[PDB]
Amino acid sequence: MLEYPIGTPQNLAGMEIAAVYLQPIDMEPEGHMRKASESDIHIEADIHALSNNPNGYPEGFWVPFLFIKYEITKVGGSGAPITGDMMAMVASDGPHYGDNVKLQGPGKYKVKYTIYPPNAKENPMSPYYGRHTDRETGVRPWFKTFSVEWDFTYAGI
Amino acid sequence: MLEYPIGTPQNLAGMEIAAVYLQPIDMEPEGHMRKASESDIHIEADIHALSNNPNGYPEGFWVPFLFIKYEITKVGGSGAPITGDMMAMVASDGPHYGDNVKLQGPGKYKVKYTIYPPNAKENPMSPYYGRHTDRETGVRPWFKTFSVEWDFTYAGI
């Protein structure tokens, strides 16, 4: 299989944050993602733990229960920025955060992800995840919400 | 601190299902886990992907967004079964499903876990996790809810 990079990964808060895209996908449950026929790409945030991750993740593990918002702006650029909220999902190459997106034609785009930890009140997965805090098995506090941004040139799949 | 085994792991549906326990833990958010001072153990379900996992997980990955119910019964003795729902959480050794539990003194206990996939109606994370189904990046359907059982001897902690 082939995927396409959006810039190069950025390392922050003990995680590698990478942006990639591929053709639009189909997902179970149906009717949540924008229809593949009405989309240009499936954009993803690939987030994995670095070595000595402060929240207890072994190096390379997928970081679960995050909430990621995105804003894609065409440089530059008559249309409104493209925005959305990713969904966590599994594919044949493992779990990702992703969304089907309709772009605004070929050209240069700015991509910004805003990444919320699993204790953020804005993150609807926060009620379902915890963090040990006892001395023997506890980990460091969650990172604070942050953003990452890249530029990429979209030509079309 | 010791991590005690509950039986030996069992392999089903491309996953290793293991049961272990340790001393009661403290967790953020507070007020979800039974107080550590009012508990005997923290019981865990350790679920990781085997090779050729049918849902797309690389070997060794934690299997996320499951929902686990447990039933702990003192073998052939007085006392009702002890039931509850685990919660997903991260510790210094990575993510787990777990819960703080009060037992009924030393002795032999049966431990049964009932494991619900992300698309089960009983799993509250169903609106928050998907599975690709397109030909190029799709995976096999989720497993159906199933149970696994072991027993162990509790001596104290």
Side-chain angles (χ1 to χ4, degrees), chain A residues 26 28 90 92 119 132-133 137, chain B residues 26 28 90 92 131-133:
Chain A
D26 298 328
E28 172 199 7
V90 72
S92 61
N119 65 345
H132 289 210
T133 61
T137 71
Chain B
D26 299 327
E28 172 197 4
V90 73
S92 62
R131 176 184 65 92
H132 287 211
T133 61

Side-chain angles (χ1 to χ4, degrees), chain B:
Chain B
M1 181 182 289
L2 291 168
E3 177 189 276
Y4 292 93
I6 291 167
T8 300
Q10 296 178 36
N11 291 346
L12 273 178
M15 303 175 288
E16 174 188 275
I17 311 100
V20 300
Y21 67 97
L22 57 152
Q23 287 193 243
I25 60 90
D26 299 327
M27 190 194 77
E28 172 197 4
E30 285 273 26
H32 292 68
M33 288 291 102
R34 185 181 177 100
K35 284 183 186 177
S37 60
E38 293 174 11
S39 303
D40 293 321
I41 63 167
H42 183 73
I43 197 166
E44 295 176 324
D46 286 335
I47 302 173
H48 296 85
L50 296 173
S51 57
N52 308 309
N53 167 277
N55 305 127
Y57 292 108
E59 187 177 10
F61 259 31
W62 179 54
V63 181
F65 294 93
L66 305 185
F67 176 70
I68 316 302
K69 294 189 186 277
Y70 62 87
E71 189 168 354
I72 297 165
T73 310
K74 200 155 175 197
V75 177
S78 185
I82 301 160
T83 64
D85 294 343
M86 302 206 176
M87 190 165 167
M89 59 188 85
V90 73
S92 62
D93 63 336
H96 306 268
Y97 297 98
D99 203 25
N100 277 355
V101 181
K102 179 68 192 172
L103 297 174
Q104 295 162 353
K108 293 190 178 292
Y109 288 84
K110 299 307 295 199
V111 174
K112 188 178 87 187
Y113 293 166
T114 301
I115 300 166
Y116 294 79
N119 67 344
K121 68 185 188 80
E122 302 88 354
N123 185 334
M125 285 157 280
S126 64
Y128 301 111
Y129 198 58
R131 176 184 65 92
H132 287 211
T133 61
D134 49 286
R135 285 165 280 173
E136 190 59 36
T137 72
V139 300
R140 297 197 55 251
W142 292 117
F143 59 90
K144 296 289 182 182
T145 299
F146 66 97
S147 294
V148 284
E149 189 165 2
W150 303 264
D151 45 66
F152 76 108
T153 300
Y154 178 58
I157 218 140

